[PDB]
Ligand binder design. Structure first.
Ligand SMILES: NC(=O)C1=CN([C@@H]2O[C@H](COP(=O)(O)OP(=O)(O)OC[C@H]3O[C@@H](n4cnc5c(N)ncnc54)[C@H](O)[C@@H]3O)[C@@H](O)[C@H]2O)C=CC1
Ligand SMILES: NC(=O)C1=CN([C@@H]2O[C@H](COP(=O)(O)OP(=O)(O)OC[C@H]3O[C@@H](n4cnc5c(N)ncnc54)[C@H](O)[C@@H]3O)[C@@H](O)[C@H]2O)C=CC1
Lengths: 469, 469
């Protein structure tokens, strides 16, 4: 049978996205497809299971769904292991977002706007946790080592952040068969929409590192199409306004990076600029418009509170479904339980490409292996690839990324990854200190010590404290 | 004949060092050895010539000395071209030190302690000028292009700073036969002296980039000798005191870098730490002892004033020598005009190794060419080499530099070199802005613009202004 395991299946909406895509993929929607849903939170796990079962039943799909609280049971003999888990200390918290919000506030207390985990070229909220992302890294490495023993054919499809750091560390330190997943590339379709271009007529390519990807090829009707972006900047950018806090692809920040680097940053890359765009909320609003993006002291707490209410509502929905088994979720909440339209994410196409040779182009975090020849072979990049039964085949990246992207953006971001991995494996607080010694917001060494101390002393960081002690 | 040209021969003491070494090297002290002394400053050039002639006459050396104000005449058919020139705008200044002192003060006015040219891993005073070192780079590239035409066999021996940036740019953009020169490696002999070790019994090696070199091998009697440094740190470091502002090799800063990186930084590398050691004068004194090193607002102006008085005194000596041709300089000022003892610098051994096959081990700035395999082949490194008539032969660097030196020190310093070269060749002020956007002392973008503006507007920066305009 085909065993697909979701680790952190209490991530309700994502679990439902995965299930619905599987149930709507002919080659996978079979009685021999077993979806294992695993999580450490009983209530969230049960809600995802109840909704996933009902959803499948309404889609007339014969896939079997299994819930389990045993990580080993989920890993054993799996063919694909999707890691979307976000660890937390259950004595203090109910989910992982809380530890990042609280550490961030301590960082701000000590003079680090948006927390010590916000750094140049890595502003994406919750991407790293206390620089080295100990609990997230630790879980990924634990899964990889169990996978090599109990499931040596499986793919570990890492979606929990930091995707770059984790995919790199697992590859390098375990050799387990990990691939990192992020669909930030989808930003390109808004570029095409704003320039009035049929995406099917655009010859495009993107490449870089996770949340550090660039539109390296953008061609239309046998010519460079970037001059069309030049026109849009001249004639449309003054009137641009974001539709919501996440809407940054065509923002002044993205175009300012385009003007300097020569290629347009794509997706979350636009959030990950230098400090020029992020010194404070006023600066963020100048460069991202009225919300100041999503990575600020107003919008991010607002969003994390929305997620909490959504978590509770879906759980309530699960209870409601038990009491009223006659209701059709596809009808009452079609947005959450759609039929006839795949989500568009890459996870289930990846599985269907590996297992059923349904060949597709995806953007995946895999070892460079010479694709960007100026970088080491073993560094994990986010690359355009074709996936089939024979594995993952990297496209040629042409044009190459510009010289400025290499020396000003990709290499600094790659070194930060190496810093963060060194901080994890050395168990050495001096390495965390050195990272903050390279941080523009540091004013003194005593400040670094004090901010780390207070973070380490937070009750829910007992394990972290002992690890670095 | 053998033609050795000194560009910037108004650098009196260095010129005299070169002349005296040539006059005391049997294979070079010949009638067929023509030393050309070239400089744009008539008074300084004439003083170096008069003293160089008298010095040789007192050394009973038959070398011919020629002074000229024509760069082309000095370059034409030369076999070796030593560039020690420090450009300046003669409408405002008398020497190059003045432009760096004044720009530095403007940087401090705008909140950049020790000027915008002081940066992490590059604190050495006067190493770069307004980041891209325009007048210094411009002169080196002008010499290289004249050399390829008028002297295609010559070695361009670059001693004027920035040695790293300039050697890299000349190699990459002209392919001229440049080699960069710095004797910072000499720090090792003080390490051996403080640990009571005969240098002849120490098996040692150093490697890195210019002013970024590390004692990668330190062995004594068939064992690692670093444990002897551990003992010294435990028992002698508390009593350490610098003999003068330049004395940093065994300082708390060097040992703190040793503890983190696993290898001891050598020479000027100790000046080139992170901002941990340099936030302010008090911090510098904690980490370098009572003077706070040489790269601070007290000691550096003091030193540049000493150099000025030395310049005038030597010039006066030249006049005195004319009026009193009976005096023996070797007798009256043996420290400046020694006999029977070579200086110990690398320039004349280099020449004698190339021209006369007198084979020697030196530390020179040359292309990596695989010596440090984790770095690009074309990046200029400061490497241990053997020089003979057949060229420059890199030793194998064993042990390799540590992982932390690579990701925390060498790679950041190499990227800064690439930033500085991009800032020069692009003629693009936005690249200078980006460098300051990566600077910890920057608080706002408006601050960057204002500090560059005021620097660009200084009268003696007219050429710089127009270049970036
Ligand atoms: N690329 C994509 O489509 C998506 C990416 N993600 C990423 O995954 C990470 C988590 O995000 P959310 O799902 O919204 O957070 P979440 O907190 O809502 O989900 C985490 C789930 O993992 C559970 N968990 C914690 N520790 C676990 C452990 N040892 N074993 C098994 N389960 C454990 C938690 O109980 C929770 O149910 C984020 O970094 C996010 O960016 C998650 C959703 C979709
Ligand atoms: N490795 C070594 O042994 C030494 C290295 N240097 C380095 O060279 C640079 C200059 O240092 P100093 O000699 O003390 O400064 P300096 O100002 O005393 O000497 C510079 C000389 O070059 C002349 N000059 C300026 N523009 C010129 C041009 N276009 N053509 C020919 N000559 C020109 C100047 O008139 C002056 O006489 C520094 O970066 C220094 O580190 C210099 C002395 C020895």
């Amino acid at each position: 049978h085909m065993k697909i395991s979701i680790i952190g299946a209490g991530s309700v909406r994502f679990a439902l996205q995965l299930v619905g895509d599987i149930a709507q993929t002919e080659e996978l929607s079979r009685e021999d497809t077993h979806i294992y849903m695993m999580d450490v939170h009983e209530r969230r796990l049960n809600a995802s299971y109840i909704l996933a079962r009902k959803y499948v039943e309404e889609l007339n799909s014969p896939v079997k769904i299994v819930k389990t609280s045993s990580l080993d049971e989920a890993i054993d003999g799996a063919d694909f292991i999707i890691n979307t888990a976000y660890p937390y200390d259950p004595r203090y918290h109910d989910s992982g977002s809380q530890r990042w919000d609280e550490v961030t506030k301590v960082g701000e207390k000590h003079g680090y706007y948006r927390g010590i985990d916000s750094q140049e070229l890595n502003m994406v909220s919750t991407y790293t946790y206390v620089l080295s992302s100990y609990p997230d890294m630790k879980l990924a490495l634990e899964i990889a080592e169990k996978m090599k023993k109990m499931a040596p054919k499986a793919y570990l499809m890492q979606t929990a952040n930091p995707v770059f750091e984790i995919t790199q560390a697992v590859r390098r330190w375990t050799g387990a068969n990990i691939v990192g997943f992020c669909h930030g590339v989808a930003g390109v379709y808004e570029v095409f929409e704003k320039l009035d271009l049929d995406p099917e007529e655009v010859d495009w390519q993107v490449a870089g590192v996770n949340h550090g990807i660039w539109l390296n090829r953008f061609r239309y009707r046998g010519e460079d199409a970037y001059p069309l972006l030049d026109e849009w900047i001249e004639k449309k950018l003054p009137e641009w306004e974001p539709k919501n806090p996440w809407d940054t692809q065509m923002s002044p920040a993205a175009m300012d990076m385009y003007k300097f680097y020569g290629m347009l940053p794509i997706g979350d890359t636009v959030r990950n600029g230098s400090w020029k765009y992020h010194y404070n909320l006023e600066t963020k609003k100048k460069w991202f418009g009225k919300f100041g993006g999503i990575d600020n002291e107003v919008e991010r707490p607002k969003f994390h509170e929305q997620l909490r209410r959504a978590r509770e509502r879906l759980i309530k929905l699960a209870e409601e479904v038990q009491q009223n088994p006659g209701m059709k979720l596809t009808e009452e909440h079609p947005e959450i339980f759609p039929k006839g339209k795949l989500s568009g994410e890459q996870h289930i196409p990846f599985i269907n490409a590996i297992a059923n040779n349904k060949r597709v182009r995806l953007f995946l975090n895999v070892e460079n292996q010479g694709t960007l020849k100026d970088f080491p072979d073993d560094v994990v990049m986010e690359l355009p690839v074709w996936v089939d039964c024979c594995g993952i085949h990297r496209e040629k990246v042409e044009p190459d990324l510009t010289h400025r992207i290499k020396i000003f953006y990709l290499w600094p971001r790659i070194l930060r990854m190496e810093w963060n991995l060194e901080a994890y494996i050395s168990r050495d607080r001096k390495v965390l200190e050195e990272i903050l010694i390279r941080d523009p917001r540091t004013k003194s060494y005593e400040q670094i010590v004090q901010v780390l101390d207070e973070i380490f002393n937070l009750p829910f960081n007992e394990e972290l404290r002992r690890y670095y002690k």
